[PDB]
Amino acid sequence: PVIVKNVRIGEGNPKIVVPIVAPTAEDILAEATASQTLDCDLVEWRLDYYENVADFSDVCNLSQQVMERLGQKPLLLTFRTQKEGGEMAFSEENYFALYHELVKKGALDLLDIELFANPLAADTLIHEAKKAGIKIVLCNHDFQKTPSQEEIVARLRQMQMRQADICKIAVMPQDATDVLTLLSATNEMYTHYASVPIVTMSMGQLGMISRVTGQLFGSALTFGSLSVQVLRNYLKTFEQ
Amino acid sequence: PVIVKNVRIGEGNPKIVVPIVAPTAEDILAEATASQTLDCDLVEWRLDYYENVADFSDVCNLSQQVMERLGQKPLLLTFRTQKEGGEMAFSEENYFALYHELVKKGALDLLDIELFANPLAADTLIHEAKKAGIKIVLCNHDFQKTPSQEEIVARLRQMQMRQADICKIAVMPQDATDVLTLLSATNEMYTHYASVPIVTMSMGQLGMISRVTGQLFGSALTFGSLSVQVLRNYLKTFEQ
């Protein structure tokens, strides 16, 4: 169980994550302040939405102001790359340079790193982040399709092998079978291979059940904009 | 799609069944009247709870009174046998004799017959009930375990082969894998073999999700005492 600011990720009910996707600084701070009265456990600031994300110092400073308003909720920072659903084109070099800077002079508790990004660069980044006390979330997103159950499991297993603190995968269902594929992949990974927390979801309207069944099948985080209030309520209903 | 009093079973969202399990006629009538303002689509009266179920004429008359109070919601009549989770010991002979009288002198829209009951007696009953315009629900309940995915499918296919209007199976999960097994069995039956509506569920707290996922995986009916209020709300949230 990964413990950050008293939030026990990988224990009890799935912890709730709200994303900030606002593009202006002013709205990003407002929504951070708003999280203080939202029924969630942590906050993900999505970097690839931020209009000034190419200014790495602006981002580091802004990250400080966001943290100050979070009422001691963990702050996850994520630059989702374009090939996995992200908002903007970004060179690999800028991808790793931004993260290295946040690690040095930014505020954050967890760092999102895509499994498929340049591993040599990513591994070096991982150790620099961990040294700073940042928890690592390795992750993969397929927004077009659902890989086979074995491939989802293999990807989750490769993240754990790369010393992820938390392994995450999101896949896009095209029918109800794909949702089962994701749910089963989640169950197999969790019961048989996982010794760190894992996070999975089947995206879209078809995969929505995957966002409230985390306790049953072994998914330790769920993301809420399903809204965060409905999410907590639904988690309690399906609580084991 | 089985259409009964305008309830289109097998289309759109899962239709909600509220059971009546009160033991006295007084409370059974009270609950039938109360269903008129409950957010449900039909009503199952569990005969095996009824203190006077052995008085077949009393049951026939009571069913008439129940019907008058249903605001034109379909009435499903069910005697669940002990071996399948029922409330009382009851001979095979009295089980068929009860249903036969109901077919002739009772009021009911759907009749619940268990797959494993004496099939020759059961088939003769089925044609008599259909002749009286009654829909047949062939069904199986395992309240202690979950059979293999293939067996669940085979039982559902056997129910359809015996000319069921609706095929139903409830199984008992012992872990998360068992719930998936049931959900997967549902999906496979629905997509590859079903030409009549099917109803599936994984019992208990573990399998609670299978009560709100009918539209996604192919289950046409869901039962709520989850309460009927919560159920409809939850069906709308996960609606496709």
Numbering used by the authors:
A (entry chain A), B (entry chain B): 3 to 227, 237 to 251
What does the paper say about this structure?
The study also elucidated the structure of E. faecalis DHQase to a resolution of 2.2 Å. There are two monomers in the asymmetric unit of the crystal, forming a homodimer. On each monomer, there are a total of 94 atoms belonging to 24 residues that are involved in the formation of the dimer interface. The non-crystallographic symmetry (NCS) differences for most of the residues are well below 0.3 Å (as reported by COOT), indicating close conformational similarity between the two protomers. Moreover, these residues, and in particular Lys170, are positioned in nearly identically positions in these three homologous structures, despite the absence of bound ligand in the efDHQase structure. Such similarities strongly suggest that efDHQase catalyzes the dehydration reaction via a Schiff base mechanism whereby the terminal amine of efDHQase's Lys170 reversibly reacts with the carbonyl of the substrate. In the absence of bound ligand, the β8-α8 loop of efDHQase adopts the “open” conformation commonly seen in other DHQases, and becomes partially disordered.
3-Dehydroquinate dehydratase (DHQase) is the third enzyme in the shikimate pathway. DHQase catalyzes the dehydration of 3-dehydroquinate to 3-dehydroshikimate. DHQase from Enterococcus faecalis is a type I enzyme.
